[PDB]
Design a protein around this ligand. Sequence first.
Ligand SMILES: COc1ccc(OC)c(Nc2ncnc(Nc3ccccc3S(=O)(=O)CCCNC(=O)[C@@H](N)CCCCN)n2)c1
Ligand SMILES: COc1ccc(OC)c(Nc2ncnc(Nc3ccccc3S(=O)(=O)CCCNC(=O)[C@@H](N)CCCCN)n2)c1
Lengths: 481, 481
Amino acid sequence: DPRLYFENRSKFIQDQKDKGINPYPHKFERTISIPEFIEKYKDLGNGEHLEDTILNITGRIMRVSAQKLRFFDLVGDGEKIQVLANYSFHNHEKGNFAECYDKIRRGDIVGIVGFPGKSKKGELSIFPKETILLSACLHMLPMKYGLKDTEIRYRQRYLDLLINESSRHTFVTRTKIINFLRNFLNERGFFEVETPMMNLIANARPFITHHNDLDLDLYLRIATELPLKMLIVGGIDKVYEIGKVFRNEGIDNTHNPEFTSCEFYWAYADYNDLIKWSEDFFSQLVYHLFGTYKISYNKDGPENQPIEIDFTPPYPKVSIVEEIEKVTNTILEQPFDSNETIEKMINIIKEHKIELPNPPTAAKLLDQLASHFIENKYNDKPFFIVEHPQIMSPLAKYHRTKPGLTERLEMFICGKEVLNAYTELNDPFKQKECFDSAFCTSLEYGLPPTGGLGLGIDRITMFLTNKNSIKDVILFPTMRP
Amino acid sequence: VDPRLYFENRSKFIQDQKDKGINPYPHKFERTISIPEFIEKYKDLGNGEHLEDTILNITGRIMRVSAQKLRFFDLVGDGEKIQVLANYSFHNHEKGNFAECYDKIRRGDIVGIVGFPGKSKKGELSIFPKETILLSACLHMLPMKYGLKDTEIRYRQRYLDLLINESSRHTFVTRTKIINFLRNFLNERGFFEVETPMMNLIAARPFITHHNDLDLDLYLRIATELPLKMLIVGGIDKVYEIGKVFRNEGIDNTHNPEFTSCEFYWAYADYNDLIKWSEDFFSQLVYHLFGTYKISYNKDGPENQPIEIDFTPPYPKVSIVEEIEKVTNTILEQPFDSNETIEKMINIIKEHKIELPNPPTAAKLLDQLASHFIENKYNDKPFFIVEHPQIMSPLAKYHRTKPGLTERLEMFICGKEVLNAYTELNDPFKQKECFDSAFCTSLEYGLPPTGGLGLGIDRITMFLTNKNSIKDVILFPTMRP
Ligand SMILES: COc1ccc(OC)c(Nc2ncnc(Nc3ccccc3S(=O)(=O)CCCNC(=O)[C@@H](N)CCCCN)n2)c1
Ligand SMILES: COc1ccc(OC)c(Nc2ncnc(Nc3ccccc3S(=O)(=O)CCCNC(=O)[C@@H](N)CCCCN)n2)c1
């Protein structure tokens, strides 16, 4: 019984207390980490002991086996050495050999005083002259299988990190990705800021909460767009923010209501500048992690074959309106709001037995046509969908040569959006929504020509760590109790 | 001079240009060089010297206009400035006539210029235009510095502040330099940056928001303390987070409901390690920014003389129970919850006419005592208040020699708490609050001896950019409309 094992250990904790031994001592003076231990002593010869060097080392006992030789696994920082407790090397003054090492269970945190060496079998080991209990583990830890089907991976992420080596590697990579992005932006002149997480006016339903001092209801931000643009007016010409945004909608495998975004604004940047930034960032980010531009991705899970994703630039550019016509052998033109055009779009959706969006707005229909007919055109390499109609992007600047369109771009990997960008509409007389109030007033003080860009960091982490669910890249995903 | 009329005249002018076939918001300008690169490239040339064969493309905001065929302007970009020297004889009359091109320009307009670099006779570094294009007109009058002084126009329109006030740019660059410095200080030392949920199930009064898909009510984090500690259990022995936390209380000069905190956790660290880290970080940060350990701070406004704060380590330490006892000449006995001891502290509050907190709890009583008798003991230098009673820090580990106390430290600058740290209580049985539930469970898997520490990023910034109010280091402080 896990229940009964917990009570035995808890009684042991009192038992130790009433023998005068504190099972939770204050401080152990460590000399060296486990990863530093492995590097420093990996190339010794087999069976060799460095008996003069005395080290203080800590770690988590992860495996216990045995009659006067005791073997443990000691793990720290995702790496592992062996503990070889020899009765001959023990300091019999500190207590009975057997009594000390019989109390120890898998999962215990211990401090060890000892010397480094390799086994006769060549396993690099610490040879304890003394071993102190530093913090007991009171439950039975599980082994790997316990954490494959269940969702305690998500409710008890600390157990996952201890048991599954890959989980650590996933979450190191996530941190490496964000470091690379921050460094990539800082090296190019960009300036990182923080804008508010609550605002008075907030596409998506907001999180709402009551602010007790102002006696007002506030909204968690759904993006960082408006405050960053104001900083462009203010003269910070390259500005960005990495932080959480919130959309109070349904969960699925690539949608978490709270997620991590990077948005930047680049004054005097145009469409080519933005395309170039996107190809440089992804191609260099992949190479930095993997030493190659090609990665394998299990688009349909580990039970199915992976596809290969090639991040070698340049990436294809697919114009959305033109492409929908070609694959559908249709012609969609004029006001796309034209009921005529709408009907062509609506009849395409029913002929191919697709869901009709409610309401059947021209922007919603075009999006639906793109997810079915364009968004899975390539899967072997990322690509852009470009030049969306103005009705789908009311904040975007008009395309320079094609009427009705914008210079917008969207990057896709395996049919999922990861990057969104366009040049900004800066003539206040043509921004329809200026019939948020602060942004319109700021526009009248002069916004230079500007490009904005946003990245979805969780999804980017999913592809580069071969995950299909967003919960596998968020440390503590929010679940019902 | 009506602000109303000035806007209508500039608006009419914009439509007037559009009717004339000129686009006052052209799509793009191919800038070849920024104003800071211009200054760096040509600051060393000689008086009156021209380089007229080098044509350059430059952009910026017109901030000064002077008054018949030699026009003068001030062009700023990236917080730097050059002169625009418009001469009839180098103006391309192919593109239009000199007088009306330059008569249309107003203070605030964004322009693109093709021209060559040179220095005037009086020595002012200048761009000499051959062609000047409007990129985005400024439609309102731009305030003077004095209009941005007693006002809260600085907060509602931070972009005007950033355009007019040289100092404000410096404040916010400093903030970013501080966070950059902290992140690299921790990364150099093996710490691992992570992200933790902004909404949790169990959480100062909190912000409460409703989650639609789970249909549960969640609380914004008031701290990142608990999940970081769960990552320690899970084997991430050096972990930290920089992000917002939220406290749903009243605004004042050192309290904003959303603020920026950094928290780190360092397994196998104790009181002495955290003290040392604090001194190392603060003394090295001030030296990094200013080149000296000593800075001037206007504790009482820019209207009063500054004080000198010396960050040369080491900083004094002061025991909270002992020191209150000295200055109040009254002994407070170890059962700090005793009716005798509570009554004794209430009386001192009465005798000195201090506010009695509600409820009059021993922890609140000790804090009130500390705020009045210790926390302003030093202003010449930062100092620590240490060894708080267990009843004030129910998550802190017990002091190893003094019964009733902990090994807790709090760092103060100029009467204000900036940093708060302790060895963590890691015995699940001694957790009185463990009658959050996810965290009590996590402790039962074994938390090594750990030291934790939290910093107030906004407060540190105020002291290092000579500010009195937190609103002056937060880009967009939230205020009633
Ligand atoms: C529909 O939105 C929802 C709705 C409900 C949700 O959960 C309940 C989630 N949640 C969610 N979780 C994780 N990843 C994503 N990625 C995502 C989803 C949809 C579209 C794109 C991405 S994306 O390309 O990865 C990142 C965003 C990029 N673009 C921007 O930031 C623009 N604002 C600034 C561009 C600059 C122009 N001036 N979403 C999202
Ligand atoms: C009740 O608090 C409120 C209430 C209302 C507010 O606005 C309406 C604000 N708002 C606010 N804005 C800016 N700065 C501050 N600073 C502050 C305030 C009070 C005490 C200290 C500071 S501090 O030293 O700058 C931050 C240090 C935090 N240390 C920690 O969290 C530890 N758990 C770290 C782990 C220790 C090891 N396990 N506060 C705060």
